[PDB]
Symmetry: C4
Subunit: 274 residues, 4 copies
């Protein structure tokens, strides 16, 4: 066999955090990542676990997550460093039988704790489980540069921002037909931002935090990264276009309608009506 | 000997898709790549082939491709992932004796299929074989960032866009004297876009899809990548120039004429007449 | 055991200089880095030391640094090259018992000397030791591209520049609540710039040199790099925003106040009053 | 011992071409590089040489280069590929006893030839040998993106362009006090451009070719790359500044004078007088 560091999920967390770091999305400790696992994923490795797993209570219980293991990035940890020492910067946590707290089964060495945003990641996992009949398994936050820049110049409105993003690369309507939900600026790490993000996650796989960054959900690390990368690539194109004095032409409503029909998706009505 | 993963063509596909990924041209599954092989390339490795190669019919037969093997990127596959698992993300296909379909000789594991754009890649291969007396072997699509951005600000016209690209780096006229053919925006993955792209490929080695990306043809992976990289580098320069308020000076018609004479190329007349 | 090149501190210097090089912050010999060590760090490796450590006097003695070892980048050395040959490009120096000079214990082969800016790094180390009760251990200088660009377009004033940086990413107020001190342009490598930078370091962990670059202080290589990376990422966002015609909206004073309260920091009053 | 591929000079050529490729300066075959060697460099490896070195005549003899070996990039070769197969993409050439031609001692396999710009590189080597009493050993050409972009917006005049570059990063006056000589646009690969570049090399270590790229000279690969990287980094800053609507403040003549005095350099008078 092998050590847990060579598992598909530890190697996956490494690749995702490194690639996000390399894109320029995760300065310092900016960003966090949680992946919902099955018991079968971690089972072969139980003797690599901490002998006496630390328990941390959850302020709000999440019975929908009872008995569920996750691999998570740590609080104050750098995406840059994950590849260098996965055990120091990542943890495997398991929510207990009534969803009242979790045990830290592996990693987060030297008394590290999960991302301060864990109970918020958990709330969004809950809404995404319901919204997708258990398909979604990942919540990813990063400081995607061009998407951030756009929040200073575009109206911070779901329909308006979504429509520009759709225009900025042909694939975007196909990739996120439900659009990108945009919150008002909120104090990060608060219960209130967690709740508001989870509420937006009911209707969208992508949520923007003006002047701060993006939140994405998806079934796998690759698909979730890909989702955020698609929105950020469109944002990159838009920044160049706006910098050159704006669109002389663009993808029309008629074209977006034809696109949604061909790919069997229902584009967000408000964004499409503009 | 060696396994097929170490062949020049599998290693070539890996390098090309990775480099395109690293340039920022291939977010998510954006992009696709097909390379026409000879029987001699794949022959040493036949016992590595799937035991019972899956057959897929072609909607339109292509007898010009009868008996021809290709290595191709898979549908829904990420350029990012090719280096990690070539067999999962790439396939070797061989068109049958009457060009009615192809067998999947190798790769595309777990029921993966070639790029949904395979019959379109095939149509362009056909036109490029005819246009170059069999020299061209590669069709490459990617989401080249600056070229995309320019399609929102420049007139989407072959002559006009080609002329700006020629101006944006001295080598461009020498590298693509036949210019870049620009289609109207079209729904991707359709028969209609495949046909229109193949028609443009009769007269140009590079074709642009407004608000979406670029298509290039060439004799080798390196030369085809190089061709697209040249156009995208010129586009990068132009974006910076337009962002700084536009050209105060540029390469003149007189200079472009002198350049084409020295290098023994015939610049596209309409682009040169501007 | 191991050679000194595999120590945490030599490997740390390698990663920090390489990453800064990869970010585009350290063309040629642009940039310098010094890390304050303990005797326990270098002790195991004393027999790897130069047999007869070269002594260099300090123009101004620094008794606060008596007996203190540092690992430092060399004068005229390239950040790019550190990874290739740490011993050629890095040195371990130890300040003597009265702070009158230092011995070169290791590295800086072929008669290389520490960064010409060593006595200035030392002055800032002194002010940062006092300002943080010995917590700070690193002084890092680099040519952070977007921060440089901003010094041609923003008022070069501590309060004004700090406030824009806070606005340019939500985390910035939390990461540098004391702000970024901005000096007038000064001739580099002079006693005068060393003194002025050290004076600014009394009140700020980050100091800008208009038309030149940034200086940061912190307790570890990672945290200091992270600090500079945070300011530069905000600057990158601001450059894009200014390029697109400026802020239509931004983080308000009210929001910054709420942010500082939640995170338990006191934002620089003058920057906050704007 | 070792094979020639592990020599300092083959490894140096690899690093220089790869790094230039990674910076985005060398799309396709854009760019070329020649390094003047001594007989002592190549001597240990003579039995690795081609058995019967191919001879190529020089159109104009260069007796100043008699008996001199060089390692060079090949014609039509990609900087990207050098790391993959140095022998295919690089050659060691040795100019014969009267400077009438050269033998290809090593590399350029499969009938490859040195950069079509070899006799031009050679002419500049000659002028740089004279200008520096034999210190300069490298001629490097690349398609440095931001420097190219600036040639569409700044006056293509030595004094004017040099002065902006000096302003764009404090170190530039110190690094190239003699300035950057700017030619008119010329047809590349011609005798005329070779001559004009060599003439500019009498007075400058850096020469710009509008709408095309840069040429640099220096004593080592690192120092020459560093020289070009410095000018390109300043150009990058200037592009951002011009994109944000231009300089509100900048490095003054008075400051540049003070800078040149401190560093013991004589700034180009015409650029300084502006
Ligand atoms: Zn965040
Ligand atoms: Zn067990
Ligand atoms: Zn919504
Ligand atoms: Zn596409
Ligand atoms: Zn067999
Ligand atoms: Zn056409
Ligand atoms: Zn500096
Ligand atoms: Zn000892
Ligand atoms: Zn201050
Ligand atoms: Zn060139
Ligand atoms: Zn011999
Ligand atoms: Zn001159």
């Amino acid at each position: 066999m092998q050590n847990i560091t060579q598992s598909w999920f530890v190697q996956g967390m490494i690749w995702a955090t490194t690639d996000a770091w390399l894109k320029g999305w995760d300065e310092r400790n900016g960003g966090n990542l949680t992946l919902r696992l099955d018991d079968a994923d971690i089972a072969p490795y139980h003797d690599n676990f901490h002998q006496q797993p630390r328990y941390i209570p959850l302020s709000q219980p999440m019975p929908l997550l009872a008995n569920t293991p996750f691999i998570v990035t740590g609080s104050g940890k750098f995406f840059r460093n994950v590849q260098l020492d996965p055990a120091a910067n990542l943890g495997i946590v398991k929510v207990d039988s009534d969803g009242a707290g979790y045990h830290i089964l592996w990693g987060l060495t030297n008394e590290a704790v999960p991302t301060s945003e864990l109970p918020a990641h958990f709330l969004s996992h809950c809404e995404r489980i319901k919204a997708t009949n258990g398909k979604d398994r990942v919540i990813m936050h990063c400081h995607a540069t061009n998407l951030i820049a756009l929040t200073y110049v575009l109206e911070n409105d779901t329909a308006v921002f979504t429509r520009q993003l759709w225009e900025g690369s042909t694939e975007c309507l196909v990739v996120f037909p439900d659009g990108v939900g945009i919150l008002p600026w909120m104090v990060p790490g608060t219960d209130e931002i967690g709740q508001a993000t989870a509420q937006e996650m009911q209707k969208h796989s992508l949520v923007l935090w003006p002047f701060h960054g993006v939140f994405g959900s998806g079934p796998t690390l690759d698909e979730t990264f890909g989702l955020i990368d698609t929105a950020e690539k469109s944002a990159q194109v838009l920044v160049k276009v706006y910098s050159m004095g704006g669109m002389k032409q663009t993808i029309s409503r008629e074209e977006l309608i034809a696109l949604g029909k061909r790919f069997g998706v229902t584009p967000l009505a408000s964004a499409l009506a503009l």
